[PDB]
Design an enzyme around this catalytic site. Structure first.
Site, PDB file in Angstrom:
ATOM      1  N   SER A 175      35.376  40.461  44.614  1.00  0.00           N
ATOM      2  CA  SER A 175      35.665  41.227  43.393  1.00  0.00           C
ATOM      3  C   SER A 175      36.718  40.544  42.532  1.00  0.00           C
ATOM      4  O   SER A 175      37.730  40.070  43.077  1.00  0.00           O
ATOM      5  CB  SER A 175      36.200  42.621  43.771  1.00  0.00           C
ATOM      6  N   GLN A 189      33.415  41.436  48.461  1.00  0.00           N
ATOM      7  CA  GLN A 189      32.271  42.145  47.922  1.00  0.00           C
ATOM      8  C   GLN A 189      31.044  41.230  47.970  1.00  0.00           C
ATOM      9  O   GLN A 189      29.925  41.711  48.152  1.00  0.00           O
ATOM     10  CB  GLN A 189      32.503  42.651  46.493  1.00  0.00           C
TER      11      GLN A 189
END
Length: 197
Positions: A26, A105
Site C-alpha cells: 500500500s 497488500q
C-alpha cells in the site's frame, strides 16, 4: 527504477524466457515499490536483460490504504489487473516460465490472483514469494489452489499482519535483505528446476 512494464511493452517476436509479475505494498511508488527493484536486479543477473521480463502490477492496482480492509485484503479491480497480466504473459509468451511476488497488500493481491487463476496458467507459475503476507494467518501460510512447494512466505517475527492484524510494526518494513537475497534465490531455483536449466 520502481516502474517496469517489460510485459506490456513486450514484443511477442522477442519473448523472454522468464516473466516476473510483482505487486507492491500500500502507498508504494511505481509498480514495483521498494522490494521489486532488488528482486529484479538479481533475476537480470541470472537471466540477462533479454532473458527475463520484469512487470509490476500498476493500472487499476492503486495500492490503497482502505483496500486492505476489504474481504480479500485488496480490491476486485486490483485482482482483475493482475489476473489480466498473467493472461497477457500466457498469450504473448506461451513458453515463458512465470514467477510472481507481492509485498503487504501486494502479497494478499498475488494470493487472490493466483487463487482465481485458471489452472493452466497457474501451473506455469514456477514459484511465488510473499513478504509481510497480510492473509498469512487466514490462509495458513499458503496461497489457496497453489502448491506449498512453490510458495515461499517471508513473515518476520513481530510482523503483526502475519498473525491476523492490520497494523504495522518495525518488522513489517524489514524485508529489504530478503528481497536482495533469499527471495530471488528461491525464484531462480524453481525456474531452473522447471526449465531443467
Amino acid at each position: 527504477r520502481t516502474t517496469r512494464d517489460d510485459l506490456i511493452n513486450g514484443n511477442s517476436a522477442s519473448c523472454a524466457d522468464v516473466i516476473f509479475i510483482y505487486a507492491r505494498g500500500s502507498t508504494e511508488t511505481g509498480n514495483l515499490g521498494t522490494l521489486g527493484p532488488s528482486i529484479a536486479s538479481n533475476l537480470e543477473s541470472a537471466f540477462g536483460k533479454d532473458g527475463v521480463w520484469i512487470q509490476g502490477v500498476g493500472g487499476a492496482y492503486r495500492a490503497t490504504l482502505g483496500d486492505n480492509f476489504l474481504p480479500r485484503g485488496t480490491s476486485s479491480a486490483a485482482i482483475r489487473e493482475m489476473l489480466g497480466l498473467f493472461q497477457q504473459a500466457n498469450t504473448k509468451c506461451p513458453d515463458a516460465t512465470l514467477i510472481a511476488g507481492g509485498y503487504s497488500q501486494g502479497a494478499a493481491l498475488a494470493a487472490a490472483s493466483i487463487e482465481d487463476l485458471d489452472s493452466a496458467i497457474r501451473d506455469k507459475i514456477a514459484g511465488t514469494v510473499l513478504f509481510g503476507y497480510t492473509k498469512n494467518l487466514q490462509n495458513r501460510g499458503r496461497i489457496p489452489n497453489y502448491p506449498a512447494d512453490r510458495t515461499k512466505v517471508f513473515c518476520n517475527t513481530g510482523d503483526l499482519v502475519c498473525t491476523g492484524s492490520l497494523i504495522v510494526a518495525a518488522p513489517h518494513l524489514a524485508y529489504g535483505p530478503d528481497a536482495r537475497g533469499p527471495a530471488p534465490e528461491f525464484l531462480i531455483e524453481k525456474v531452473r528446476a522447471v526449465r531443467g536449466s
